[PDB]
Every structure is written in structure tokens, then in C-alpha cells.
Symmetry: C3
Subunit: 36 residues, 3 copies
């Protein structure tokens, strides 16, 4: 339905937001290795 699609979009926004945070966390560990 329309309301189901709104909630689906909001959940996907939260998933990309967690995506960015997880990538930053991994970048931090990689950069420690790259300059260590």
C-alpha cells in the first residue's frame, strides 16, 4: 500500500545511514594499518 511504501523508504534511509557509519568504522581500522 501507500503507507507500506512510506515505511519501506524510511527503513531504507536508516539502513544507508548505518551503511555510512559502518564504512567509516572500517576505514578507521584500514587507515591504522595503512599508516602503521
Amino acid at each position: 500500500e501507500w503507507e507500506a511504501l512510506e515505511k519501506k523508504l524510511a527503513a531504507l534511509e536508516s539502513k544507508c545511514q548505518a551503511x555510512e557509519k559502518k564504512l567509516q568504522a572500517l576505514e578507521k581500522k584500514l587507515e591504522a594499518l595503512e599508516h602503521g
Copy 2:
């Protein structure tokens, strides 16, 4: 259209799902280096 937007949302859901799997795969390789 409405139907085009539904399919766009479903494709984006699949893209984030592949996102998570690719990040996990890279985390596995990084963790091997970090503790190796």
C-alpha cells in the same frame, strides 16, 4: 509513475542488502590483517 516508484524502491532495497554483504566481506579481510 506509481509502479515505477515501487520497482525503484525494491531495487534500492536489493542494492543496500548487497551493500551490507560486501561490507561484511571486506571486514573479514581487514580483520585478518588486523590480527595477523
Copy 3:
């Protein structure tokens, strides 16, 4: 609104597209370490 949801979806598509590019960039650095 409907138009707000269309723009929200387009912004999320751009965010996953940047997601993929950032993951590839990190994979490149990780692969340098893994075979270095």
C-alpha cells in the same frame, strides 16, 4: 507528500551509488595491504 517521497527516493539512490564508490575505494586500499 507524494512529491516529497519521490525526492526522498532519488536522494537515497544517490546515497547508495556513493556507498558503492566508497566501498570500492576502501577495497582498493585493503587489497594493496593484503598483497603487499
